[PDB]
């Protein structure tokens, strides 16, 4: 049974890796800041690959841990994960919970985004290294790839006479830079995509419609005054 669990987990991981590397394709050269391209990276996490190997080929060799009446199955898994790969050693979050997490195959994969940042090539889109607008554009790119897949799949069932409505959101748009916001707008309109964007300061004055909201206290309750805005100053 342990060997079977390991085998099914590995097959699922490989199938998902294939599917994600598959979905990666079909991306146009977005121009969010210096980010000139986006891609998805999927790989098996070594900490869990070692655990999978131990489960598949060395189950019996730690049966002592498993037959431990003191340990539940998730706790047994957590303790085994502590024994091998002891650099993850962690017990302040309860072993039950970490074992339960370990009962999710998806966690076993590292699933990250690479960005063609300038001419540096595909670099891991770490938030501490990318401009925040570039990261927001990357996330939007991922979301639009997903929704593109959704629409394409249902292309057969839907008649071409109808092109389904498209609408996503973006709070805290003040994070973005003018380059990222313009790239988002061009991508969305190219994809006939509608957007609802929010920021403290009006970072999109020259595009789309704009509203401003002000909250006032009034006789022990609250009201929101909405005022329109116009494209200049």
């Amino acid at each position: 049974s342990s060997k079977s669990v390991a085998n099914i987990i590995r097959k699922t991981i490989q199938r998902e890796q294939n599917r994600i590397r598959m979905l990666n394709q079909g991306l146009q050269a977005v121009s969010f800041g210096q980010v000139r391209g986006v891609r998805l990276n999927v790989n098996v996490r070594e900490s869990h690959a070692i655990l999978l190997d131990v489960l598949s080929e060395q189950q019996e060799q730690h049966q002592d841990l498993f037959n431990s009446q003191r340990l539940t199955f998730s706790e047994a898994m957590a303790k085994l994960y502590q024994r091998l790969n002891p650099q993850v050693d962690m017990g302040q979050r309860l072993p039950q919970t970490i074992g339960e997490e370990l009962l999710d195959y998806r966690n076993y994969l590292e699933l990250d985004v690479e960005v063609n940042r300038g001419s540096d090539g595909w670099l891991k889109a770490e938030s501490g290294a990318l401009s925040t607008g570039e990261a927001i554009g990357t996330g939007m790119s991922i979301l639009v790839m997903v929704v593109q897949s959704w629409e394409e799949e249902s292309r057969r069932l839907r008649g071409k006479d109808i092109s389904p409505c498209r609408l996503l959101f973006l709070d805290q748009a003040a994070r973005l830079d003018a380059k990222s916001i313009a790239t988002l707008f061009e991508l969305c309109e190219r994809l006939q995509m509608q957007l609802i964007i929010a920021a403290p300061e009006n970072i999109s004055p020259e595009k789309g419609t704009t509203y401003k909201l002000v909250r006032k206290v009034f006789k022990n309750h609250e009201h929101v005054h909405v005022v329109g805005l116009r494209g200049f100053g």
Binding site: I9, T12, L143, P164, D171, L195, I197
Partner: protein
């Protein structure tokens, strides 16, 4: 082909919003305001109208997340005032058919913070009829009333041509919306709704911030019950082994 377009969003009797209507742009609509301007409330009201599945809805904001944004009630009950309230969206179909989808929300009684939600849809409404006017009755000088579902049905039925429908299930709500080209995917299953909500809620937050990176796995990778059944088989074998040993 002319993709359908969302036209406007009407928030009625919401927290801070009584009968507000925002006309959505064709491409980009922007909201501005300082601390606590309630923009997250507007986004939450829209998405609640889109996916009225109370379970999926859980609105920790993008920043200053959690209950302190008014979301210990899942950001629905307390983000509403007491009593009848509405969240409605007009859409111009690619067939060029106006359709106002909407949901009637009501705060549930007791110490609990549950919300009673009822989906509904309207077709044939004259393009001039603003939902704000449609959903409100002018009682008293310049301070209009909001009318419940039954009064709305009466008022709409009194209008020629307009057809008003209520969905006993969110599933048929989304089925009709899709049939009108409102949804890209046929959310036949609650799992489809779950992934849909995942995508919209991630977009709401935007970017690869901590929550988005954490839940990217869920967003991209479907759940597999095969792993779960295999793990449970291992568990049963281990239990029976322990029994035999003892």
């Amino acid at each position: 082909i002319e993709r359908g377009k969302f036209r406007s969003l009407t928030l009625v009797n919401w927290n801070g919003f009584f009968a507000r209507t925002f006309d959505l742009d064709e491409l980009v609509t922007t909201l501005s305001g300082g601390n606590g301007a309630g923009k997250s409330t507007t986004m939450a009201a829209f998405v609640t109208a889109l996916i009225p599945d109370l379970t999926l809805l859980h609105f920790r904001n993008t920043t200053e997340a959690g209950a302190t944004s008014g979301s210990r009630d899942k950001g629905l009950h307390g983000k509403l005032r007491a009593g009848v309230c509405y969240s409605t969206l007009d859409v111009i179909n690619s067939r060029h058919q106006r359709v106002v989808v909407g949901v009637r929300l009501q705060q549930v009684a007791g110490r609990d913070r549950k919300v009673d939600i009822k989906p509904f849809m309207i077709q044939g409404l004259p393009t001039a009829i603003q939902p704000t006017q449609l959903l409100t009755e002018n009682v008293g000088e310049r301070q209009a009333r909001v009318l419940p579902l039954n009064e709305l049905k009466d008022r709409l039925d009194e209008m020629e041509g307009v057809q008003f429908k209520q969905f006993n299930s969110i599933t048929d709500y989304h089925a009709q919306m899709f049939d009108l080209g409102v949804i890209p995917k046929r959310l036949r299953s609650a799992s489809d709704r779950s992934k849909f909500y995942r995508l919209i809620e991630a977009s709401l937050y935007g970017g690869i911030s901590s929550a988005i990176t954490r839940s990217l796995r869920d967003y991209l990778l479907p759940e597999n019950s095969g792993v779960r059944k295999a793990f449970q088989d291992m568990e049963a074998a281990l239990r029976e082994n322990r029994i035999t040993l003892e």
